[PDB]
Subunit: 458 residues, 4 copies
Amino acid sequence: MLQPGVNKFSLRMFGSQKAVEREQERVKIHPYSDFRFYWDLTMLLLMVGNLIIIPVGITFFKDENTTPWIVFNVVSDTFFLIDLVLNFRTGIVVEDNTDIILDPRRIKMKYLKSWFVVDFVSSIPVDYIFLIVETRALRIVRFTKILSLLRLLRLSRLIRYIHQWEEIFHMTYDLASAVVRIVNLIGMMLLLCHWDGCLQFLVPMLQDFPDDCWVSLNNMVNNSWGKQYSYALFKAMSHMLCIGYGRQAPMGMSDVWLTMLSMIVGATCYAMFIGHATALIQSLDSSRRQYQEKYKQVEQYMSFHKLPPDTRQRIHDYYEHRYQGKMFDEESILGELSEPLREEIINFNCRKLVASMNFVTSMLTKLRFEVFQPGDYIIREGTIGKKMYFIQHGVVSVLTKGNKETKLADGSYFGEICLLRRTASVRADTYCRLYSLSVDNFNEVLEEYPMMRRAFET
Amino acid sequence: MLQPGVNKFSLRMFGSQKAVEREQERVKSHPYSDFRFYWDLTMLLLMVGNLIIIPVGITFFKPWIVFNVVSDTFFLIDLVLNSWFVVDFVSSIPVDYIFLIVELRIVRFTKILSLLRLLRLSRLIRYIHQWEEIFHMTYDLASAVVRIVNLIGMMLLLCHWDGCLQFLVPMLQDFPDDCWVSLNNMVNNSWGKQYSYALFKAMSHMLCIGYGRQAPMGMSDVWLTMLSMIVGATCYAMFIGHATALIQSLDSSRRQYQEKYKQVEQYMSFHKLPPDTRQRIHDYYEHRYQGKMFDEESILGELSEPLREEIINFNCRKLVASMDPNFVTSMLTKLRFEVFQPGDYIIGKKMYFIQHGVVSVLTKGNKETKLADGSYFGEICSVRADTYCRLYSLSVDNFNEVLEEYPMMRRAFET
Amino acid sequence: MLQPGVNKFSLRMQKAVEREQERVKSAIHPYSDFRFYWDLTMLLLMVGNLIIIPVGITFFKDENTTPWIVFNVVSDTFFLIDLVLNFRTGIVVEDNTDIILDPRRIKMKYLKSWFVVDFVSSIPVDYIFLIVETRIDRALRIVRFTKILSLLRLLRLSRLIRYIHQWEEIFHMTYDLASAVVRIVNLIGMMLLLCHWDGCLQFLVPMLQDFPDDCWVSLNNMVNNSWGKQYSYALFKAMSHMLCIGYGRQAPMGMSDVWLTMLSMIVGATCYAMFIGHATALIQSLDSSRRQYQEKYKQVEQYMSFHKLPPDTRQRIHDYYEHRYQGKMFDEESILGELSEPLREEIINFNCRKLVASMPLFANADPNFVTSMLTKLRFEVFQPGDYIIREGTIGKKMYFIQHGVVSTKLADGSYFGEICLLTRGRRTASVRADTYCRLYSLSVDNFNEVLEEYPMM
Amino acid sequence: MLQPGVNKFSLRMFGSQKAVEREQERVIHPYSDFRFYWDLTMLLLMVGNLIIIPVGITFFKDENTTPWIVFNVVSDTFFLIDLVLNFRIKMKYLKSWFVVDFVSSIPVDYIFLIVETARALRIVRFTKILSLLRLLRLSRLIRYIHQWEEIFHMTYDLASAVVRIVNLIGMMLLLCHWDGCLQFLVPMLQDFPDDCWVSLNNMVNNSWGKQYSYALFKAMSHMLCIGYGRQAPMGMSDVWLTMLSMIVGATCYAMFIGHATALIQSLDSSRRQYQEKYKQVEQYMSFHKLPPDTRQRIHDYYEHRYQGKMFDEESILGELSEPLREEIINFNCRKLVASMPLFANADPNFVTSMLTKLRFEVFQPGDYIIREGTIGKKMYFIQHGVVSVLTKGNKETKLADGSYFGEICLLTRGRRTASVRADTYCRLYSLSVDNFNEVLEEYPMMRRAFET
Ligand SMILES: COc1cc2c(cc1OC)CC(=O)N(CCCN(C)C[C@H]1Cc3cc(OC)c(OC)cc31)CC2
């Protein structure tokens, strides 16, 4: 299973099949192996369970040496040693370059600059081994508890595993991905609040019961772990939201300093999260802002030249019925694409129109999109012929004595004459989305294409 | 009648009347029709009444039987006329009354079923968006205040929901001694006071001021105020972020003007510019752009040909005609805007058209010639500027292409 | 006298000033000195009223003392005077000299700018109401309605902001950090005025309802305390509502207090939120070229990572950027483009005459095409160790050394290999860069085209 | 060592010692190493006094013992030496901060009380007020730190960002404890009022530890806008001090949060500039109706061409100088363009010009690169991926990195003899025929060599 390649992500990370096979011959543990996926899924599950339950067990409750908590801790930590020794035989992507690092020497030397020390200190049963090497009892309990808090260093594993797997899975960068990111931020913040509540319940217990503690004043001595956890989370979330100090203001120096640090970090983190979410939602609403800026610049330009209200209203109508209220660019998007994709776009969008009438593939590279408005002349009499048109969605009425009122439907074509002084003229009935072809473009595309131009001229 | 026949908001969707007859066969095959507009308006009024009345009735005052049955009739009209199907299927029928047919806990079940009736706010969300672009006034500061007031509006109905919920939860489970009601002794006071205190706790929790006159004691109070605080603060913070972003976007053009002037400040810092020029540059930007930015070239090259023709005509018809439509029009299509500054020398291969201001001519023979709006000069193939002129330019080369492109009387023009 | 004859702000917007006189010779101009001083007198007197009236009408119960009445009536006389002077005045709006000398024109324009508010604020509605009541002749109701109708005078905020805006659009000479501080202190002034008004209201709303036991005045034992020791705590509650600190000493109890607290939380916190957003926007707009430089460097580093460049180049490019743009943007081509001619040639002259005129060929000739080719010059920045030109390479680009000394050693004002342009072939000199030499450049094509367009020399 | 010749990052400013020799030729230098050591000791002693002076003034009533006198006189002497060292350029500085530096450096309070020796208690109050006004090392520290910003900086990445927020929070905690000591000092100077908060809290004779750790709590509660403290102000000098504390704390915290959020947002800017472009393109496909397959095959092209890494190749190349563009293009393309035999014998100048005429191009698997019967227009130097060339009765021949397909019709014409197809995301380097023609017409040295 160490050989990578799964249609869920490998076929998207590597569009062609062969590249995926190339990954396989790279082996001839891999980052993209399915066994790695299963291992990291089980990891995330069990280790998030640890990050949630360990602060509850070690801060609240008594008689920690009971069988269920002990066996849970030892099995989790043994899995942690397993993945720790696995980290000495693995591979990661470096600076986005796909490097297998199947050599243990490399995955040791270059890993000797990572956070390996954090994983070392976290993934060893410090509480048990420190108790054994020592073997004042309350003081030893204090050390073993405060070092048991070091099991929460698995947040580093969580964040690194998320970072290596944030880019693997995507569906659509719309509200679906944005809500995923904001939900991840909210989950991290509630994890922080849970940790802070457990800390504010444990620091009194670590000192043993004070008389100047929030626990004594609130009489939360021997009621329940559920209510105590609920009220500690209450204090932590009130601190970050800046509601207050719960029921009573701090009374003891220990709790004064504790609430000071808790509320400073909570307020700072809440402000950071709120600003990040606001920036994310503005990025979601980015498409409207560009159009708003362009329209405000247009309005200021019209005011700078003192245009009459009729022209201003016509300009407003043209802008609202050209860009449809949110902005895009023809030139840049058609210039930042490879040849096959550009020809695919110009074929699908603009081939049915020409098919209603390799020269064509070279003529299609000169069709300029163009939108007019009702009542506006397209071609005017007395104007030298310089352009034709290819209706994509519009109805143009020819102005002629014979052609009193016509409605040219989709896929029509006019102005072709004088290509090879307009005889007539046409208006716009509805919102017509024309195309265009300058006579110079036709002359060029023809003169680099002579081997059929010798019959085109006829 | 499915025929819209609207010349006020359907005219914005389709400017010409002809498309109206097109919409005619669109009927013969409507969201913009009169009947749908009337139905949506009546349903909108009734559902606003729903959102601001039913939470009051379900929580307080444990008549109203008249209002709920008639409301359900119009909801059924929506479903038969009709993405979000189970939501309407649940919050479109009298679930509370029909639940008793299936069956104190039962009575409580009817109310929590009625709590699902609020989901039409989602229908309002979709509706309020699709009325947003059909009609508009302008993009001035006034419309922004309207948007902010509407934002405050749905956040305030959210406050109403939150207060009703915060009064209901300690009311469903009788009234425990640890509930905020028991602590405030306001068990049997007036409806006004109860609603005021509920909306007050909700207001404080979202606005992060306090809990009120007390602090949560029972587990129900703690957890209720818990989620109240988190959701209220979060939603209010995003609301304020959106409002401030919109306000800052209102005066955008001034912002880009300021950033461009800051970049010019850096540029003048680099080249050790003398203070006189460092002040003249500031004045020239204060009057050329008037502290608010635009780009004439991009806008002109972006507009459709008839529109661009309209603006260029309205700007320069009197200017050029003061010296065939096609030749003069092509000449107009090549005028550049060259706002000058007082005391700046002007001029010889270019001619100048003065739209605004006063220009002076310096010569040794005659003392000067005073010119005004519309006068043409520089016609060859030095002079000063007195006021903040807005001269127009005609480069000789551009004149050459304008002449050569039309050969009907080209040799006559060069003659 | 009514003619605008100032030499401070009318100068900024010279013969046009005489044209301003012309627009008055057709007969008060908004830019007139007397108008400006009179508007300043209203500025002071408006600030005074907006502070005193809410305190006077709320505090100092049974306000039958004479000096307050004298001050109020004289202020009302100034208000009638300035309202009637608002008739037949020039209003420069839309950056256009709309002097509207026509009485109908000034009438309609003033009727387009909160006319009815101006009348209702200017007229002493309290005095007229009391005099008509005395002419006519529930007593306590009339007593409270006296203060209620005197409260109509707070509509003068609209006039105050209108006058300051008529001056805000004039005083815009600075847009540096000083202007940001001016905007910030204006925001703080408006916010503190709202604090003062909310504090006065926190007492007025109870006061107009006498003093019920549920009001905070009763519970705080502040019924009989001094006026200062009441205003201070009222403003304390106003700021405690605005800043979202708390309800004050004790939570709201009565329905009136609860609803007033709700309204104060809204009008307080929302306005403070807009204030904070404005402050953050201004402090970020203070430093923007640094942000743009950071974005450009991030894009360049991102591109450099895209091409898997060796670390030596990844250090050389970083050094080049930090010693070329040095954390602050400058786009020479665009800035020069969007400048009118005379400023452009002035900048180019001051930059380039001493540098380029060192060698004799262009110095001898007439400086018109010389100025043109100077405007055609380009900015180039080099780094030590990189050879500017190579031996056995076609010499086509001269260099005018504005700064630094590079290798013989050439000091500032020298020139690099100008003989290559007039000759042709491969240059045999490999000049070595030794300093951060900011040079100037051109091309042989530019030289050929300037000699073609100007073949006189 | 009063000259800036140093063997550290100062060299990064001025590479060659001859460039450094210019400053040695001109030349106390602020950039000198001795001034560097003096600035570090200034920083250390300045932060020490900025933490200790407000506490020494307020809680330590009549600290007439010798240690405090020694501390104060050492500070006075060292600040005076710093002032006299900080002194041609003085006239430019003359209208700046000499009143500031004079009042900050000298012991105004101590010299004031010497000439004096209920007037005595008022003199003590004046001494305390003068020593408080002497705290202008806030401004001094701001100046000296702001000097360092231009002096040295490695990168503006996340590493420096967290440092910037840490600096802001350190300055803000400086403000916190200043306000904490103030909230005790102002009531203390009046003598403990009955209605004051200290009296209500019974914190009248408690130790320095409590009187500091709860005053700090009170003074940064108003900063985090959490509340007042144990009680409402009650006292009215107290409520005015609460006015000032509320305003300054909330306003400064608002500015600090705005600045920090803006920094963390500008930290990730390229991703935003790519997301905006992708939203624009998404609207482009929404406008001209297209099948979902084309939408997917454009999304894939962006995800494997820009990779979410938003950069503009033309602008980045242009804004660089030629003696820096040359190394980039060389490292990217010397192996590729020297691979084919015809250009291996080409002139280095001709090679570099052809490199400057090279253009980056990307393709997708299954998409034709060159077709059958089309007019040949460009040339290709494959840099990545594998390409499948199909030439009539030919199987899927697979060229690799460094190869070249399309070299035909480099100067000739005719229809395409073969059709190629991309097997992977082959990142090519295109090369148009007209560019080849123009480089040969401006380098006619080997026109006759390439004529064959
Ligand atoms: C009163 O101070 C602020 C208020 C607002 C804003 C900014 C403020 O300070 C940064 C804008 C905003 O997002 N908010 C944040 C609201 C979040 N909390 C709940 C508001 C209150 C608690 C908090 C947190 C603060 O710091 C961010 C703060 O600074 C004085 C004020 C407050 C809404 C209005």
